[PDB]
Amino acid sequence: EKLVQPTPLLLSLLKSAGAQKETFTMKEVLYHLGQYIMAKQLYDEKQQHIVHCSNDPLGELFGVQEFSVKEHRRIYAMISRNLVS
Ligand SMILES: CCOc1cc(C(C)(C)C)ccc1C1=N[C@@](C)(c2ccc(Cl)cc2)[C@@](C)(c2ccc(Cl)cc2)N1C(=O)N1CCN(CCCS(C)(=O)=O)CC1
């Protein structure tokens, strides 16, 4: 599997959620981002698949401040913009 390298901001969020390295598989990056979202309680109370970013630094990585965990292609796109090329 390919080990990717999150840029500064993204990496900071992953480490806050428990990540302890600099390179990860995309599966690991996503797992840690999910943990970050749960830790920060960014998910919507009523529609739990919805993630609110307008009040969190995670919002800096998205154009539209709300995304669904069901939007895998969109989420992969966001991460790609935050990987060392
Ligand atoms: C952060 C929220 O993530 C998810 C939330 C949901 C619910 C709550 C809407 C169903 C479903 C799937 C999830 C959920 N889907 C995952 C697998 C995923 C994997 C790849 C991609 Cl591209 C997108 C999503 C992941 C890892 C996630 C990863 C990145 C991001 Cl930005 C958000 C979530 N995620 C996750 O973190 N959890 C933790 C909480 N778990 C809670 C499981 C509870 S239960 C009763 O359904 O078993 C479920 C898995």
UniProtKB/Swiss-Prot annotation:
Subcellular location: Nucleus, Nucleoplasm; Cytoplasm; Nucleus, Nucleolus; Nucleus
Ranges in coiled-coil conformation: none
Domain SWIB/MDM2: 2-85
Source domain of life: Eukaryota
Stated role: E3 ubiquitin-protein ligase that mediates ubiquitination of p53/TP53, leading to its degradation by the proteasome.
Family in the record: Belongs to the MDM2/MDM4 family.
Name the record gives this protein: E3 ubiquitin-protein ligase Mdm2
Organism, scientific name: Xenopus laevis
Gene that encodes it: mdm2
